[model samples]
Target chain A: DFRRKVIYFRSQPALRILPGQCHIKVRRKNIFEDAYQEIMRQTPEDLKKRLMIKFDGEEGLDYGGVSREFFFLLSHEMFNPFYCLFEYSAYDNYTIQINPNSGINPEHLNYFKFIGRVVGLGVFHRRFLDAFFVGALYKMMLRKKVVLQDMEGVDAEVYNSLNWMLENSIDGVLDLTFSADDERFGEVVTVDLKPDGRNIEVTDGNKKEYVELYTQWRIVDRVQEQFKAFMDGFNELIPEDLVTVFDERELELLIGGIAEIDIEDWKKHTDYRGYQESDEVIQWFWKCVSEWDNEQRARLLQFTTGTSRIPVNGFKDLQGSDGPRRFTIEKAGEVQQLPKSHTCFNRVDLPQYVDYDSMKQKLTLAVEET
Target chain B: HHHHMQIFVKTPTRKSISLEVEPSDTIENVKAKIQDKEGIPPDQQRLIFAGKQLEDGRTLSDYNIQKESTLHLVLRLPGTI
Candidate 1:
């Protein structure tokens, strides 16, 4: 009653067509505002649809290229440090964390949920977030406990205090209680860990509990509401096991894709228009590309594709304007100028140069331009 | 040979439902069955596995989909909104 055709694709992933695709209409001039307004209104069912984007006045059909560019551009707006939702931690080299002070904005509580869906869609569509998160934020989801180490990525000051507390004898030396000096809008308010915590004495007997409670309050309790809000949207589109399985870096690679580009796979999956495989220009083009160092190769790819990272499935499945369209080099003018990249098509219009030197020099200059 | 196998579909509600089918069935065939079970229109449903979309023209085995494997079922909405 059943049959099996046991043939395999040459490392190409499944058929690229989503069963149902949503073609989004956006404007390049207001990409952030446009994307935010449209995305926030999507219902549970609306969130599930596959997203394809078309900018206003742009002819690029969103087969895949438009979708990729949408993911790439929208994220830049969503995570800008100037935005009030997440704070950019300078001590952690500007890796972002949930802004505890975001509560200052009344509507901020629910916005994190909206932010989560944006994150969920990127991972669901196999795209990466443009902004990096502090390690503690990523670690909190999988590991429920907040350790002293977690404080370093979140608040370096908090981390240092804990380390000092552990190193010294606090009895008779330090006057303390289990209350966090709540830093309100330019004023200090005392928030007790326990109901009468401010009245309780801090001694050797309960110092460890105070430390534990403080760590919990500092890294987690203060931000739990916002974290849960984000998780609501994140968990809705993605399965629990789909995430929680990986810690921070593993999740980064899985979502953002690998940094290194593969050459053989790149050549094998590319298509040449108005040129043949055996043509000297075609042969020398790949040779010139192959001769360039990895950084140069990545730069060239970013210049052509807009994203430097290779998808986990590699070049054979590079998203494009059409189904599984290859990295295409189309025929253009004769050695007049540098190759022009149409990032919306995953395509480049190359000048038909006679020799390798001209091709290499022009290509190099194009990548180095921006 | 008995070719019937069961596969799991995780729906929008985050619940998994099992369906009995054969590996030879095209993706559209499975969607038809899902539409019947869930009462959603076939046009509104999309299935994804291993991070790749399952196109209607392709069969389960075309992408090496196996018995007991789970597929994500997403509901579609018009982008014009």
Candidate 2:
């Protein structure tokens, strides 16, 4: 049973251009098997029908065509809340091919490219907010001006697009809110961009203050202003030839870069209670964070933070026997046998579950006693 | 007066633990059972159902935690500086 909720957004009105001959390839793996099979197995015979496994068929529907569009938008970081309601395919990949020379004007093509790049950059900005501002909520409380410096590869490429969009296409205004009223993180901080778009109203815990965005005191704001300037001169920006080639590795890097926390840095700074124990599984958690290099750490962070628990190694070619044919996804991988010691490398489930409050209390008590 | 109602406990590790819980059982009791398996303390556990935090004192019936209902668990330490 799929619940559909229609959301209304205040969209900027402009020319309503009909989708020009657009060839979109959406490759997907059906969630019917993954989402239903487990439930059906565990459920009682009477409750089996209530599980909502079969709507159109007992065999299930081919959800690739529909799920592909959703995954495509998600990859670009354009999230729609409505997508959450559907019982769709799980690990889907999408490639959008828009013909440039098919009787389309150069101006139209340029607009199309610009709009596409803008959407991509917007997603990058939203991710940046989550990684730096929200994810590093603790760091912000410590007044740490988190900035991504000396970035290379996809990080740098994404930053470039972000810079361009901020300067040219996007309005400089940014709205961000972080609230955790639970015993652990009790502070609720909200930062809103002022009307000038060059200043912010910050409500941090009990204190509320206004800060100039480009001022020397606020390093974060200054960095953002610098980004805005970099974005303004799009003519000077490099071509998207290198940026558009997003592979599995590049996507991983993007995830890592945006996640903001260096695993080593996080471990050094943050205290994780109960991780010091010698239990094999307990020790495995530490090894997961400590043993891996920066790249591996980033990939692990992505996996841990719910970027598809299922392994999605891009779209597999189905018609290898009969030359090149229409693309379809290969079924899910077979369940793996358990390893002797279930280390980070072998373990499919490596979520970073640290007892934050317990660790904090321990740290505080140690500090007070000292 | 209690009967077994099957439910899934989704942990922070993306692992789900299935339990035949009673509707009369408190959420704290559920947490204790989860603690036995996952090693996470009941105090550290934050059980959320249908977007609201499940109070420890409340029974499963109060929240209408039906059979096959999945409770999202977010385990964390107290605070950070």
**What TM-score, computed on C-alpha atoms, does each candidate reach?**
0.52, 0.25
**Model 1 stretches astray by more than 4 angstroms:** A1-18, A62-65, A261-370, B1-81
For each of the candidates, what fraction of the native contacts does it recover?
A: 0.00, 0.00
* TM-scores of the candidates, chain A only: 0.62, 0.23
Docking class of 1: incorrect
* Candidate of highest TM-score: 1
Q: Could you report the DockQ of all the candidates, in the order they appear? A: 0.01, 0.01
Candidate 1 structure quality by residue, lDDT tens digits, B1-81: 559889998753336889998998999999999988978677766687765668999999997888898887755322212
List model 2 lDDT by residue over A25-144, tens digit each. 221333322322332233122221211222223333444433333334333321111111111111111211112111112122223333233333323222211111111111222233
Backbone clash tally (model 1): 1
Candidate whose lDDT is highest: 1
**What DockQ was computed for model 2?**
0.01
Give the DockQ of candidate 1.
0.01
